[PDB]
């Protein structure tokens, strides 16, 4: 069949409009190119890319046949000729998240403004989760040189408007993601454990203001990990055991990391911490890797030292990279979850890295950004929808 010709029902969805329509287009000489449809809130789009002999293409016969069916039953029809027409739609050149309890119309208007200011058409929108947080998916396509202005702005955007944006590549490569680690104080875990053990020294107060002192970006981390550790020296080592007892995990990370194995990750933690006491709960969570640093024990009591070599701010690249040649997983299929400046150079060195609870330090140089303390929400950003989540937990 010789010339091109295409063909586009829109109106009020109906079931069995997709059947009507084909069997009416096998009475003339069709072969498909393309077929596009969808529904969205009943509003019935299909578009239909057809090859056909010029001898049937240049005649009324498949015109009047279409239109008389189509429009029999209730929906609207267009027929034209292609020829130039390009067959199949080009790839989206990055993902766009936008989330936020709640998503306001002036933000999530403000991010298509600046979208828009940049030459980006917006390729596609879709909603990934109405819980805990209204989250929602914009593939979209990018002039060359602008995604470095484009994370420029959307941060801004956020900033001012309240809302978590995550701007992310969306290539082959770069979407077959494989391998997570989460920090472990104020993100996978609940609070600091470095003061839950300073509080049973009763030094909680001068601890926490160092440890915030830290996760924000003033001060050296072995130097602010080696005086708060000197607070413990003194503490019989079974208190190690008193605080792994009382750790919460962050809520809806079991649902994380559940969800996690099923796509099939190598999920691992990276702390500045204390293995002694990760070890317990990363074997109840079945982890793949702990890096974490030592406390110092004599005669069964805590020295206030820490074992070295002490796992730095670049220690924690370095932990993660090790892991990725363990597990064998390239850098840009590694994913990293952290929440202050200790974090900062994992992040980067991750190919996909989320601040989660930033301190601001973070937020300044993460791929992308959470506010809301749920731990779920690190699923939607690597591209699960609470839809699926839910049907995949509930079948077990
Ligand atoms: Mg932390």
Redesign the pocket.
């Given at each position: 069949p010789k010339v091109s010709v295409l063909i586009t029902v829109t109106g009020v969805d109906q079931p069995g409009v997709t059947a009507t329509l084909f069997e009416v287009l096998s009475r003339h000489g069709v072969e498909l190119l393309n077929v596009e449809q969808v529904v969205i809130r009943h509003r019935l789009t299909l578009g239909v890319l057809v090859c056909c002999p010029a001898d049937v293409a240049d005649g009324p016969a498949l015109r009047h046949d279409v239109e008389a069916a189509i429009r029999k039953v209730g929906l609207d029809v267009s027929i034209e000729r292609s020829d130039d027409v390009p067959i199949i739609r080009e790839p989206s050149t990055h993902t766009i998240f936008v989330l936020g309890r709640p998503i306001t119309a002036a933000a999530f208007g403000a991010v298509a403004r600046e979208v828009a200011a940049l030459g980006v058409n917006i390729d596609l929108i879709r909603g990934v989760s109405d819980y805990p947080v209204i989250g929602l998916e914009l593939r979209v396509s990018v002039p060359p040189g602008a995604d470095g202005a484009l994370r420029t702005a959307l941060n801004r955007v956020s900033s001012e408007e309240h809302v978590d944006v995550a701007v992310e590549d969306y290539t082959l490569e770069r979407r077959a993601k494989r391998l997570i680690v989460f920090?472990?104080?104020?993100?996978l875990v609940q609070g600091?454990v470095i003061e839950m053990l300073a509080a049973k020294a009763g030094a909680e107060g001068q601890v926490a203001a160092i440890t915030d002192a830290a996760?924000r970006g003033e001060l050296d981390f072995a130097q602010s990990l080696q005086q708060r550790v000197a607070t413990l020296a003194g503490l019989p080592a079974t208190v190690i055991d008193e605080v792994a007892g009382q750790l919460e995990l962050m809520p809806g990370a079991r649902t994380t990391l559940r969800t996690l194995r099923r796509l099939g990750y190598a999920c691992g933690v990276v702390?500045?911490?204390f293995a002694r006491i990760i070890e317990p709960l990363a074997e109840e969570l079945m982890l793949d890797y702990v890096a974490a640093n030592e406390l110092e024990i004599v005669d069964g009591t805590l020295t206030g030292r820490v074992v070295g070599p002490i796992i730095d701010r670049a220690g924690k690249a370095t932990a993660l990279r090790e892991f990725a040649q363990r597990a064998g997983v390239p850098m840009a299929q590694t994913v990293a979850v952290?929440?202050?400046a200790?974090?900062i150079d994992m992040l980067a060195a991750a190919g996909l890295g989320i601040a989660f609870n930033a301190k601001p330090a973070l937020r300044e140089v993460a791929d992308a950004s959470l506010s809301h303390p749920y731990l779920d929400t690190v699923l939607f950003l690597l591209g699960v929808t609470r839809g699926e989540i839910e049907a995949a937990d509930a079948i077990d």
């Open positions: 920090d472990v104080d104020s993100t600091e996760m702390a500045g911490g952290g929440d202050g200790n974090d």
